[PDB]
Amino acid sequence: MKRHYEAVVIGGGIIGSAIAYYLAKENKNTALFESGTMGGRTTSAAAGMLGAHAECEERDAFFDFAMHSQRLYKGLGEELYALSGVDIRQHNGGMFKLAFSEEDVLQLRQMDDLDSVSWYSKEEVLEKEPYASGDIFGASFIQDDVHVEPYFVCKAYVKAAKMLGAEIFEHTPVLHVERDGEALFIKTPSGDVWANHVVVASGVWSGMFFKQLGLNNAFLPVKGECLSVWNDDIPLTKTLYHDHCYIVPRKSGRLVVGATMKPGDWSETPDLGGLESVMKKAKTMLPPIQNMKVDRFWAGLRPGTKDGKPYIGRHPEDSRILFAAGHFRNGILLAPATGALISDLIMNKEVNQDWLHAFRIDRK
Amino acid sequence: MKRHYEAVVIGGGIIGSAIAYYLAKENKNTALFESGTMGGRTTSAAAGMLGAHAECEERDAFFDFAMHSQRLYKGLGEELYALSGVDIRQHNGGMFKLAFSEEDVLQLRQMDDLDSVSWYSKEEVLEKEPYASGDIFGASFIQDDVHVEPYFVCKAYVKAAKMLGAEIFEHTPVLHVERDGEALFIKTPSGDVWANHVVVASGVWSGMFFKQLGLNNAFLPVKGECLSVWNDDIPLTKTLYHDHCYIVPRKSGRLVVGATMKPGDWSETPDLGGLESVMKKAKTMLPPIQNMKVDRFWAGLRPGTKDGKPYIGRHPEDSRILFAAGHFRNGILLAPATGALISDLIMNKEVNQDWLHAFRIDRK
Amino acid sequence: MKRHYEAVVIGGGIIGSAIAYYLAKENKNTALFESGTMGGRTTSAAAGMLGAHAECEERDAFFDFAMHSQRLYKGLGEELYALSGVDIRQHNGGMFKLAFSEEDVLQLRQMDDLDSVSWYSKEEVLEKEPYASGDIFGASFIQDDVHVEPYFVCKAYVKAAKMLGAEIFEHTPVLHVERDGEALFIKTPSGDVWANHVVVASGVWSGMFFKQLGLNNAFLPVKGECLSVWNDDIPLTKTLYHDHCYIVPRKSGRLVVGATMKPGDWSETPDLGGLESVMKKAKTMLPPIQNMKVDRFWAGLRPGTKDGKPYIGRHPEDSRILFAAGHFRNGILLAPATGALISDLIMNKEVNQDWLHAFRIDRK
Amino acid sequence: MKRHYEAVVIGGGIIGSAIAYYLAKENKNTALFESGTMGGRTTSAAAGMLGAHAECEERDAFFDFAMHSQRLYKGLGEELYALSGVDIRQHNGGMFKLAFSEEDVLQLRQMDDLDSVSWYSKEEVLEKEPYASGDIFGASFIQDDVHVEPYFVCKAYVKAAKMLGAEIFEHTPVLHVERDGEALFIKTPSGDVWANHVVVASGVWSGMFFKQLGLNNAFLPVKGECLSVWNDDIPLTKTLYHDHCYIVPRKSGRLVVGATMKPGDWSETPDLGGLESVMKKAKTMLPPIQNMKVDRFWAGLRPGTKDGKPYIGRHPEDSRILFAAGHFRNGILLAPATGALISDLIMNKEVNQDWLHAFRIDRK
Numbered sequence A, B, C, D: 001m002k003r004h005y006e007a008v009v010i011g012g013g014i015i016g017s018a019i020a021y022y023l024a025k026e027n028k029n030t031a032l033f034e035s036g037t038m039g040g041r042t043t044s045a046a047a048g049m050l051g052a053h054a055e056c057e058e059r060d061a062f063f064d065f066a067m068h069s070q071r072l073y074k075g076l077g078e079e080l081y082a083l084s085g086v087d088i089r090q091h092n093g094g095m096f097k098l099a100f101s102e103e104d105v106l107q108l109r110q111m112d113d114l115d116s117v118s119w120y121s122k123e124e125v126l127e128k129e130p131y132a133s134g135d136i137f138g139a140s141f142i143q144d145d146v147h148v149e150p151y152f153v154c155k156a157y158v159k160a161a162k163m164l165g166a167e168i169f170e171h172t173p174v175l176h177v178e179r180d181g182e183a184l185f186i187k188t189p190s191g192d193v194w195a196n197h198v199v200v201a202s203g204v205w206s207g208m209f210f211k212q213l214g215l216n217n218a219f220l221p222v223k224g225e226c227l228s229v230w231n232d233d234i235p236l237t238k239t240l241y242h243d244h245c246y247i248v249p250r251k252s253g254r255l256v257v258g259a260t261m262k263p264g265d266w267s268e269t270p271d272l273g274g275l276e277s278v279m280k281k282a283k284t285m286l287p288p289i290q291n292m293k294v295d296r297f298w299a300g301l302r303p304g305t306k307d308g309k310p311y312i313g314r315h316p317e318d319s320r321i322l323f324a325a326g327h328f329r330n331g332i333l334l335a336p337a338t339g340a341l342i343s344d345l346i347m348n349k350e351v352n353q354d355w356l357h358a359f360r361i362d363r364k
């Protein structure tokens, strides 16, 4: 572990790994410190949907950033594979956002004006996915809202970043960041290091560093539990989505099913009531799932911020300190764009002023 | 693997292991052939309750045999431990059979005349187990219906049997039993062996051997799925039982929760609908369980016979061939008595004629 | 489960699965019976190398069949994916068959005349794979001996077959095959069925059927133990191979390492001595593997015939009965060719007489 | 989570848990904060030997404390069970400290004068444990150095403490300890709390708190890797021990084997080289272990201080702050004594001055 680095990333989830990759891409000597193992936290719990259309409510900067990031995923798998040998496991079936009421229809048709987004009647959906619930009023088909396995997108970014020279340190938690002196000083139980730039990408745990650097930005965890089953009996190519819940078909034959919303819960293992709730919900969307064998069950903590938006930018009073935390349920989707934006800010390049203002650290 | 044995046991579940132990106890040179690993089938799925009072419906021979077997468990743990070093993990808290309706009360009070069985009012139950559902009309407390961990009762029997000279062969399925000649001849993929006595203890798979020996006795599997959670927050000493479902507190801090009933289902892994059903049921009995972290989920196949009773006895036309299969939901409870009865039949000792007639192979 | 099927396949490993796929593709009404789960035995333990160049010591019929099957894999993944949505996970890095002595060199140079096969010097190998043992004398590069994940090739075949009309029955062990009427009679615990063609694809367990049908073809298990580690630090694209041992890098970042050779051992879980031996061997081939985190360990039973060659063909005295079992170390590579050959035989199509003869059931 | 507590414990390993138990027993309003789950780190990796006779090379204060703690274990299991319903799984077989040379003999004979400790000749050892290595020169039999399952001793302590009123908070990492008011101020992501006494029991991670409070006591992790196997064939009642390595037979039939010694390594999963080394060592001690089925593998971080001794006592400049961390290879054995000592100190009771001095926080 060197004594000085041009840039240091605190956090090895998918956000940190992405940032480390782009920085090393810029031939910037960087190091990444992760408390445990790469992507072993919230990143490993994620379904992996590139759900840009799950947050188009109000076509603001937030949505544009998301669409932009979704486009960045084009060729990313091929790119990262060449350097890491790790497959991100991308599935291009697309997504069916189901409607079970007029209200659902009204919400979903709000985006018919967008391209690649087309409305399907009840009969048209069942024509493509015969086993989807028969209680649907139809569904919005989002061709581009595909999915990848998050853990491997993270591992691919890291391996690639290592092959480009990035130095990665697992089992190395950062205890403190001192902005004193002319260069930043970070302290870890395995030694202290100097850097010209420090990026905070510690997910829901990033609050510690905000406070340390004189900022009140708070993070609240919103626990989500899920399960997986083996689908060896029916065809299912498209992801089924409804009210933030989903059934995504993996290329392994498994179905990743999920999500509960437990605000303020910091525990990372599923409780019985939560799992029962997920099973019940899944059944209303895909009735046959009740006959599928259960594989695994798990949970993760979504990084919730006051306005549900992430903090991606510089420290108000110190351009050497950046932040990239608070991706509630779009972290996998936004990794590329987030990594690119942070990298451009450090490289002092020009960046979209709307996105920069949208995710600024000192928001109202 | 010797060429000849005085007695051979086909099946290494808890029934077979028990039989092998008692036979070796009689200093009878015996061998046991198990398809996979000792106790790796239905025995490993069992809750482990010594539920003699779950089948007192009609105080017939069946119930007496059960009570008798329950008594045999006295000192068994200590006995088997001395020889194997394996702890059966016996928990003596006892059992509360809950009532949620007048009908439940009527069914349960039918046994008030029995000793160690006492009725508890709603308030008396909650006094002992404050977290049991408040919707109960009360419960029948069965002090003796305690529990053990089945897998280890099986392992203890086997180890003990080995220390006494029994030869155990895992990964050795028996393909056929030839009653031709003056001695039985069993064929396995690892070699053939001769024996003076053959005991069929292959659980729900015993049907193959019945047919082979010219008998129509059929076995139907009744799949049961369960789960376990960690109870780190509330006191729970007594087993909670209702309508064949249960919540048994293990000495490790886990709660074994369960059972669905899937007749004709031969699969041994839990399906989503079954697990949801078990969770739902458990919650009505112990509301706080919904907040407990899930540990594992599994399933097993109960050996169902036409009359729900096991076959424990000699082949009608050949006293060299015995059977011990069909313990629907009392296999752990009846292991000792079953093992002792089969051992006595082979040793040509005198045995209870009522039990012998109750479990005969040629029942109506 | 119907009462009649044009073709019945016994055994659901990769061989039985491939067979069912091609039969279904031929629009033949077929059923497959697996005593446990699809691909749950030896198939799930295999490394998945398409090792055709491991059988070229003598360019006979066997080598041709092997090369033929390897070509059949061209595009197989795409084809199966389209129908199953299951990715077989093919890795095209190729293989380095290392040499640690002059004898190794002489033997490996013997295939220099083969296409897509060329010799690499010590320094040419290290140029491609820098972390390979510095003790090598060089290596033969086999571009086509790539690898796949066997379990998924099996699930892909099964799912595809289902989508084409094949009826798959897991947890349905076949007990006996009767040939007395004008059609075969298969008995299972879940009922009996008639068929015009029966194919025995029960791997190392196929012996009971041979014997049941008047054949004495023997099978001996040759247990192979393995383990996997996470390769998060060094590059490795080519499979490393030496003396039947290997280190294969999966697209997930794991290295599948191993194999012990234990004849007569039917146990399917690794013992301490075997794993220690695999670890020791791996270190001689790839030194850095010593510092990699261990992931999993497991074992499988290679189906060994008297000559290490499979039995693929019709029953000498009954052309309605076929066998496809005994693929020692090449069951994955030979799956496509074995499947197509058995299918063609059932369809009475014309087949290569050299291959048909090499895999005869009645080999002297 | 309340706003005030008389005593706060930081860290929920076996040390913090024991401390919380004794404090609760003293009817002190206490809270415990664990960043993950109770006993989830180093405590869960320990073999659980109550190895007091591993510190008798010099019969100083340390050895006395060790012997004292070992006595405290007398009846501890019963006591904790009554309140928690959790079995600590104590095995009283005792321990054989083997000798493989004359030097070993000379060193081990040095404790012949100790009670419940006696020398056994080569043939006397084999008389008790026939399968022990035939290469031994004999062994010292230590009747009292028995073993327990650490995780469960920890869960028992925690549960008992809860039943006595202690408030346990998992997934609640303590970020900072402030000492400025008249009471301590502990900050966590889930809120801040005041306390009259704070105890740092964060194992190898305790260093950040020492430094936070003006102390430079350093901690270095010494990673230990282990594995378990199933002993289903040979007898083994005594724990086998040699050069800090061991083979301990659990009441479940498993043998817990191991330990590597890797200073400075913070990773908690075993690597290939470490496990191979543990397997090699185990075989020299108990040859038959080579054929036993491997169960699991894992690792833990021994908390190493500059002198291999723990820091148990008050903060030199603040008697409201206490520390109990740095139990190198004796954290399980010393749990009862450490807990009682810290509790007595908080209750201002009288304590052994020799022990208090040996574990001083400001050791030269």
Ligand SMILES: Cc1cc2nc3c(=O)[nH]c(=O)nc-3n(C[C@H](O)[C@H](O)[C@H](O)COP(=O)(O)OP(=O)(O)OC[C@H]3O[C@@H](n4cnc5c(N)ncnc54)[C@H](O)[C@@H]3O)c2cc1C
Residues within 6 Å of the ligand: A010, A011, A012, A013, A014, A015, A016, A033, A034, A035, A036, A037, A038, A039, A040, A041, A042, A043, A044, A045, A046, A047, A048, A049, A050, A051, A172, A173, A174, A175, A201, A202, A203, A204, A205, A206, A223, A224, A225, A226, A258, A259, A299, A300, A301, A302, A303, A324, A325, A326, A327, A328, A329, A330, A331, A332, A333, A334
């Ligand atoms: C059930 C569920 C389903 C989801 N599905 C999707 C989905 O389909 N699509 C999508 O786009 N998003 C999804 N998400 C959200 C997505 O998982 C997250 O936004 C994303 O994982 C956040 O990544 P991160 O790198 O910011 O944080 P994390 O992945 O949580 O990692 C932060 C990292 O920093 C480390 N760290 C913390 N403190 C320190 C320290 N002091 N020093 C060093 N390292 C530290 C951690 O150990 C950790 O590795 C889902 C989330 C949940 C819970």
Ligand SMILES: Cc1cc2nc3c(=O)[nH]c(=O)nc-3n(C[C@H](O)[C@H](O)[C@H](O)COP(=O)(O)OP(=O)(O)OC[C@H]3O[C@@H](n4cnc5c(N)ncnc54)[C@H](O)[C@@H]3O)c2cc1C
Residues within 6 Å of the ligand: B010, B011, B012, B013, B014, B015, B016, B033, B034, B035, B036, B037, B038, B039, B040, B041, B042, B043, B044, B045, B046, B047, B048, B049, B050, B051, B172, B173, B174, B175, B201, B202, B203, B204, B205, B206, B223, B224, B225, B226, B258, B259, B299, B300, B301, B302, B303, B324, B325, B326, B327, B328, B329, B330, B331, B332, B333, B334
């Ligand atoms: C969810 C559930 C909960 C239960 N709870 C309880 C409870 O609380 N109390 C209680 O008393 N009972 C309980 N039971 C029932 C109890 O598990 C069974 O009655 C008992 O396990 C049956 O034991 P067995 O030895 O007859 O059969 P098994 O345990 O099923 O074993 C039969 C054995 O024979 C082997 N075998 C089969 N064919 C061959 C062959 N050809 N050659 C060699 N070996 C062969 C198998 O591989 C297997 O090891 C429960 C069952 C279930 C499913």
Ligand SMILES: Cc1cc2nc3c(=O)[nH]c(=O)nc-3n(C[C@H](O)[C@H](O)[C@H](O)COP(=O)(O)OP(=O)(O)OC[C@H]3O[C@@H](n4cnc5c(N)ncnc54)[C@H](O)[C@@H]3O)c2cc1C
Residues within 6 Å of the ligand: C010, C011, C012, C013, C014, C015, C016, C033, C034, C035, C036, C037, C038, C039, C040, C041, C042, C043, C044, C045, C046, C047, C048, C049, C050, C051, C172, C173, C174, C175, C201, C202, C203, C204, C205, C206, C223, C224, C225, C226, C259, C299, C300, C301, C302, C303, C324, C325, C326, C327, C328, C329, C330, C331, C332, C333, C334
């Ligand atoms: C460590 C190891 C590494 C290997 N690596 C490679 C490699 O790199 N490349 C390669 O080409 N090969 C490899 N092999 C070999 C390959 O795994 C096998 O040849 C292949 O899996 C055999 O497939 P199968 O379908 O014949 O048998 P199996 O996969 O063993 O399955 C036979 C099936 O039939 C079922 N069955 C048995 N009896 C009955 C019954 N009565 N009724 C119904 N079903 C029954 C079983 O339950 C099972 O599912 C390896 C093997 C091992 C052990």
Ligand SMILES: Cc1cc2nc3c(=O)[nH]c(=O)nc-3n(C[C@H](O)[C@H](O)[C@H](O)COP(=O)(O)OP(=O)(O)OC[C@H]3O[C@@H](n4cnc5c(N)ncnc54)[C@H](O)[C@@H]3O)c2cc1C
Residues within 6 Å of the ligand: D010, D011, D012, D013, D014, D015, D016, D033, D034, D035, D036, D037, D038, D039, D040, D041, D042, D043, D044, D045, D046, D047, D048, D049, D050, D051, D172, D173, D174, D175, D201, D202, D203, D204, D205, D206, D223, D224, D225, D226, D259, D299, D300, D301, D302, D303, D324, D325, D326, D327, D328, D329, D330, D331, D332, D333, D334
């Ligand atoms: C392979 C191996 C074998 C061993 N065998 C034995 C043996 O036979 N006998 C014996 O006596 N000892 C043995 N030991 C040693 C023993 O395991 C340890 O001494 C003991 O577990 C230490 O306990 P602890 O409570 O101090 O620390 P830990 O168990 O490591 O726990 C410290 C706890 O504090 C938490 N924590 C850390 N930072 C914070 C924070 N900021 N806020 C809140 N919580 C925090 C952690 O998450 C953790 O739960 C062994 C160790 C190893 C590695």
